[PDB]
Amino acid sequence: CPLMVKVLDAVRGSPAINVAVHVFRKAADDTWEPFASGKTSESGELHGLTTEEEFVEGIYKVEIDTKSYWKALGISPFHEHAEVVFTANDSGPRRYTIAALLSPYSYSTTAVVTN
Amino acid sequence: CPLMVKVLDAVRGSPAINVAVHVFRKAADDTWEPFASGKTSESGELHGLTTEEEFVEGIYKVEIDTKSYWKALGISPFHEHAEVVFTANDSGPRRYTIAALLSPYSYSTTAVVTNP
Amino acid sequence: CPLMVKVLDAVRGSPAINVAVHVFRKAADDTWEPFASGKTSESGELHGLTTEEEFVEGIYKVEIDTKSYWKALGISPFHEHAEVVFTANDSGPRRYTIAALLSPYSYSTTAVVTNP
Amino acid sequence: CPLMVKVLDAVRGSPAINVAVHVFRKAADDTWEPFASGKTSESGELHGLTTEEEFVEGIYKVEIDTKSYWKALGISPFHEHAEVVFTANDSGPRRYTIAALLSPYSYSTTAVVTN
Numbered sequence: 309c310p311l312m313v314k315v316l317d318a319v320r321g322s323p324a325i326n327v328a329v330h331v332f333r334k335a336a337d338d339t340w341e342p343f344a345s346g347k348t349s350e351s352g353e354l355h356g357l358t359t360e361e362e363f364v365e366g367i368y369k370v371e372i373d374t375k376s377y378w379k380a381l382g383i384s385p386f387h388e389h390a391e392v393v394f395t396a397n398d399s400g401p402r403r404y405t406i407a408a409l410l411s412p413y414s415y416s417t418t419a420v421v422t423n
Numbered sequence: 424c425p426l427m428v429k430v431l432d433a434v435r436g437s438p439a440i441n442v443a444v445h446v447f448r449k450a451a452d453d454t455w456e457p458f459a460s461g462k463t464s465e466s467g468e469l470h471g472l473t474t475e476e477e478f479v480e481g482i483y484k485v486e487i488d489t490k491s492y493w494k495a496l497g498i499s500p501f502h503e504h505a506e507v508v509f510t511a512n513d514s515g516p517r518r519y520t521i522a523a524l525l526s527p528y529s530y531s532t533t534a535v536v537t538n539p
Numbered sequence: 540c541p542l543m544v545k546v547l548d549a550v551r552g553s554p555a556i557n558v559a560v561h562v563f564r565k566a567a568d569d570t571w572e573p574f575a576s577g578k579t580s581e582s583g584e585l586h587g588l589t590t591e592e593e594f595v596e597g598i599y600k601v602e603i604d605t606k607s608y609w610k611a612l613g614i615s616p617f618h619e620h621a622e623v624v625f626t627a628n629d630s631g632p633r634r635y636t637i638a639a640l641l642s643p644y645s646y647s648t649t650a651v652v653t654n655p
Numbered sequence: 656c657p658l659m660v661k662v663l664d665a666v667r668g669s670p671a672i673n674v675a676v677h678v679f680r681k682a683a684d685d686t687w688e689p690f691a692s693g694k695t696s697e698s699g700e701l702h703g704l705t706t707e708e709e710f711v712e713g714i715y716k717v718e719i720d721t722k723s724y725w726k727a728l729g730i731s732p733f734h735e736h737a738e739v740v741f742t743a744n745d746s747g748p749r750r751y752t753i754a755a756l757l758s759p760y761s762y763s764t765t766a767v768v769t770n
C-alpha cells in the first residue's frame with residue numbers, strides 16, 4: 309500500500325486507537341472527492357487505504373477526526389479535526405506515511421516518503 | 424485583536440516572514456466563506472485580521488500557505504498548506520493565537536486561548 | 540536580554556506558568572556549571588536570565604522542569620525535564636529564544652536566533 | 656526488547672539513518688552511567704538496546720547525536736544533541752518507544768508506552 313496513516317496520543321503516551329481517518333482527492337472542479345477511509349488500529353495505524361493502481365498523482369487531503377477521539381476520552385479539545393494536504397508525486401519515493409501526534413490544543417504532522 | 428497568527432521557521436531558526444494566511448468561516452450552507460487574510464510580518468506575526476465585533480461564534484479555518492513560503496525560498500515542500508480548523512467564541516469572546524512551526528515535510532500547530 | 544525562554548501548555552492551550560528553568564554552561568573541566576535560573580511568568584515567558592556581558596561564548600544547557608510543572612497540576616508526566624543544549628555566540632553575540640510546547644508524554648522545542 | 660528509539664527527519668521527509676544514540680542510567684552518586692548505544696537503521700529505528708532483565712526501574716537518559724546527523728547532510732544545526740530523560744516505572748505498560756522528529760533548529764520527542 310502506497311499510503312499509511314499513523315496517529316499518536318501525547319497525553320497518554322499511546323497510539324491513538326479507533327480514530328476515524330478520511331482521505332479525499334481533489335477533483336477537476338476543485339472539490340474534495342471521497343477517496344478512502346478507515347479507523348486506526350490498536351497500534352494507531354491505518355493500512356490498506358488504497359493501491360498503487362488507484363493512488364495516482366494529484367492533491368490529497370487526509371482528515372483525522374481528532375475531536376471525536378478526545379471526546380471519547382472525556383477530554384475537551386480545540387480542533388474540529390487535523391487536515392494534511394499534499395501532492396502525490398511519481399518522481400518521489402513510492403511510499404507515503406502521514407504521521408500525526410495529537411494533544412488537545414496542538415498537533416504535529418510529518419510525512420515520511422520512502423522507496 | 425481577538426485572532427493572531429504566528430509562524431516560525433524550524434530550518435532557519437527564525438520567524439517565518441511574508442507567509443500568506445487566509446481565514447474562512449463556515450456558512451449556513453456549510454461552505455467555507457472568506458473571512459479575512461493577511462501576511463506575517465518580520466516578527467512572523469499577523470495582527471489585525473479581525474475585530475471583536477466581526478469575530479462572532481462559528482467554525483473557522485486558518486489556512487497557512489506554507490507551500491508558497493518554502494517555494495519562495497527555493498525549496499520544494501511536502502504540504503500544500505497547513506489548515507487549522509476550530510470552533511471559536513461559543514462560550515463567549517476569547518482571544519486566540521494560532522501558532523505554527525514549519526519544516527519542509529512537517530509542521531506543528533498550537534492554540535493559545537485566553538479570556539479578555 | 541540575549542536569552543529568553545517561552546513555554547506553552549498543549550493540554551490547556553495556555554502559557555505554561557511558574558515553570559522552573561535552570562541554565563548551565565559547560566566549564567573548562569567539561570562539567571555543567573550553574574549559570575542562571577528563574578520561573579516563567581503569567582505569559583509563559585522568562586526574561587532577564589542574563590546580560591550581554593555575562594552571556595559569553597560557550598555550550599549552554601537550558602533545563603525546563605516539566606515534571607514539577609505537571610505534578611503541580613495533579614498529573615504524572617513521562618519526562619523528568621526538557622533539556623536544550625546548544626553552542627551560543629560563537630560567531631558573535633546573538634539573541635536566543637528557546638521555546639517549548641509541553642504535553643504529559645511529549646514536548647517540542649525550537650530556537651529563534653536573531654542578530655541584535 | 657523493552658526500549659526502542661525511532662528518529663525521523665522533517666527536512667527530507669525520511670527516517671533519520673545512521674544517527675548515534677546513547678542511553679545512560681542515573682547511578683546512585685547522581686552521575687550518568689553508560690547503559691546502551693547504537694546507530695539507527697535504514698528505517699530510523701534502533702532495536703536491541705537492552706533486555707527486560709537489565710532494564711530495571713530508574714532514571715534513564717537517551718542522547719541522540721543530532722548535530723553529527725545534520726553535519727553529515729551539509730546542514731547547519733542548532734542543538735548539540737537531543738536529550739530525553741525519563742523514569743522507567745514497572746507499574747506502567749512494558750514497552751517504551753522514544754520517538755524524535757528532527758529539524759535543524761527544532762525537535763519534537765514523544766513517548767509511546769504500551770503493554
Ligand SMILES: O=C(O)COc1nc(Cl)c(Cl)cc1Cl
Pocket residue numbers: 429430431522523524545546547638639640647648649
Ligand atoms: O513561540 C511562540 O511565541 C508561540 O508559538 C510557538 N510556541 C512554541 Cl512553545 C513552539 Cl515550540 C512553537 C511555536 Cl510556533
Ligand SMILES: O=C(O)COc1nc(Cl)c(Cl)cc1Cl
Pocket residue numbers: 314315316407408409661662663754755756763764765
Ligand atoms: O513514531 C512513528 O512511528 C511515526 O510518527 C511519529 N514519529 C515521531 Cl518521530 C514523532 Cl515525535 C511523532 C510521530 Cl506521530
Ligand code: NA
Pocket residue numbers: 513514515
Ligand atoms: Na454557546
Ligand code: NA
Pocket residue numbers: 629630631
Ligand atoms: Na568563533
